[PDB]
Amino acid sequence: GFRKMAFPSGKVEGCMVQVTCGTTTLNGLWLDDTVYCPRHVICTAEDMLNPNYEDLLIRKSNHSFLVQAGNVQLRVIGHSMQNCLLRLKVDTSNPKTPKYKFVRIQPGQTFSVLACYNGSPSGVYQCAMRPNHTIKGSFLNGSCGSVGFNIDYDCVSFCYMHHMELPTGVHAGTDLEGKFYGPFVDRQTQAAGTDTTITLNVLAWLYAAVINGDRWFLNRFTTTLNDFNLVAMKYNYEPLTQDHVDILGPLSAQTGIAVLDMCAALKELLQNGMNGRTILGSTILEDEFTPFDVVRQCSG
Amino acid sequence: GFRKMAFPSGKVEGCMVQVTCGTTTLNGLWLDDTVYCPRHVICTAEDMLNPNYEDLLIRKSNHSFLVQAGNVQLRVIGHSMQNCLLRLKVDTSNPKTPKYKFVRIQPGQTFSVLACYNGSPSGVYQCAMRPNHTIKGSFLNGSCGSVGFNIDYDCVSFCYMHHMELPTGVHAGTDLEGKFYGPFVDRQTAQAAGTDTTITLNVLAWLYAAVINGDRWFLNRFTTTLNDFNLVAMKYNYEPLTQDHVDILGPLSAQTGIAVLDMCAALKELLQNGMNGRTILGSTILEDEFTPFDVVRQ
Ligand SMILES: *[C@](O)(C(=O)NCc1ccccc1)[C@H](C[C@@H]1CCNC1=O)NC(=O)[C@H](CC(C)C)NC(=O)OCc1ccccc1
Ligand SMILES: [Cl-]
Ligand SMILES: [Cl-]
């Protein structure tokens, strides 16, 4: 059937460390001879509301930072700031460093999160970047510096590092260049925009239904992308982009259903409703399975 | 902030290997100097409808089994069969072998699945052992020999090895002693499970979760006795709750200040009146694959 499934976490487990300033410990990512972690490890409680990160970092030295892999200290030999991350140079290249890249994902894309506490991995789950640049994650005190990732063959694409929980319970963080997703800032003040449904992934869900023989919702009509997007917005669905259309290409080819023809099917569902009928066993449309997920779980 | 979470899979990934016999390739589990895998790797399509496994295995040699750890061949130096599993002895010990044990899990309990293809880990997800001894997994051709596990500290407790997809799309397999969960058999036939039931203890745990994450519209001012709850539960194909189960829910009851039987009263109401279209923790339906431990652990 269809499960939310994460990528195997071993290659990322091999990169997790803890970074401590004073009594403040969060997680870091050790790749070759660099450790990446959220810059607010250098904050005290009283700096959190409006920290002056440049001045806080001037007061630090290499020997202010305790970096550990397990209980083994990793000596810090340089430190600098890159946007909202610290880059700590260490004197040991991580022998478990996988093939990796740093990627900045788009809203709607999914990734696996390895939730870690004190450098120790606790659990792994899949989540989607919401259109408002938050994730609906599962993060407790001590989770900061946990990362999100995807795996392509042997290569780990790191896409997320965790920094904060917003008042509504959703989560915000950065890419591995330290740039936040969305408008958020790493100070202890912030509201996410109203969220919307990830149209790309609903379309993927419809394609998945068709692949599995559930196709009552197809119709004989089509739409333009503009007409679809104008309707979608009235129902709090995200507008489709050209990238979304391209990403649906494989599923469209697999089923023979043009992307804009599936858009016409979805438009009719939005305007008329499900009327009690179901799709893949549910009255509600799923929006956190990507086209990649559908193809992986339908075809392998 | 509450998701289905799997255990980190690294300690298990380091044990996964590919096993080939004849034209059949599936996964095995390499612990110390032993590789475990489904015995139907020795079957030919014809054998499959009524395989006399002892007779088919005595006709194999050590050299019939090709075991590969990545790019490296492991030489098989012996083999035995234990229920529905083969135990292949190899000439190399796995240095990545974690501390581990073999456990037979009980219906209602959860575990993580590491789905593997050609000895290569592909995905990880959480599963419950259903009351009818199936699991609702995500398994394709090539997934046989994938394993399910839990982690306690740094000890991996292996509880599942994958063998079968039933016509209904659910899945069936064995423990790591090779004994099937459920009435299933490793012959190539269409098999049906007994009727399934809902795991009441897990639904209650998940309702306590919803109350910890702020959601509590389904609560009510009423209570019930344990037996009256079980009468209604059984009518709706829910498992009855034992006093042991009530005891297990204590900490969640303490944390939230909601007595277990008060939560039972809320569930009874949900069973009899439905959700009115509302949702709990985002779900339109009552989730039953979170245990009390799973909820507390997160
Ligand atoms: C499992 O044997 C496997 O993955 N084998 C490797 C392999 C390689 C290439 C092609 C096929 C298989 C397999 C796992 C199944 C397949 C699809 N999803 C799964 O989870 N298990 C089986 O094929 C069972 C083997 C028996 C001997 C245990 N057979 C099975 O599931 O049959 C179900 C069935 C349904 C209707 C009618 C007859 C049989
Ligand atoms: Cl049969
Ligand atoms: Cl009733």
Author numbering:
A (entry chain B): 2 to 190, 192 to 302
B (entry chain A): 2 to 299
Give verbatim excerpts from the published study on this entry.
The SARS-CoV-2 genome encodes two polyproteins which are processed by a 3C-like protease (3CLpro) and a papain-like protease. Therefore, we generated three deuterated variants of GC376 by replacing hydrogen with deuterium at the metabolic soft spots encompassed in the R-site (aromatic ring and benzylic carbon) and evaluated their activity in the enzyme- and the cell-based assays.
Compound 2 with a bisulfite adduct warhead and compound 5 with α-ketoamide were cocrystallized with the 3CLpro of SARS-CoV-2 and SARS-CoV and examined by X-ray crystallography. The structures of SARS-CoV and SARS-CoV-2 3CLpro in complex with compound 5 also contained prominent difference in electron density consistent with the inhibitor covalently bound to the Sγ atom of Cys145. The entire inhibitor could be modeled in subunit A but was partially disordered in subunit B and the benzyl group in the S4 subsite could not be modeled for SARS-CoV. The inhibitor forms direct hydrogen bond interactions similar to compound 2, as shown in SI Appendix, Fig. S3 B and E. The benzyl group in subunit A of both SARS-CoV and SARS-CoV-2 3CLpro is positioned near hydrophobic residues within the S4 subsite. The α-ketoamide derivative (compound 5) of compound 1 had markedly decreased potency in the enzyme assay. Substitution of the aldehyde warhead in compound 1 with an α-ketoamide (compound 5) significantly decreased potency, which confirms earlier findings by us that ketoamide is less suitable for coronavirus 3CLpro inhibition.
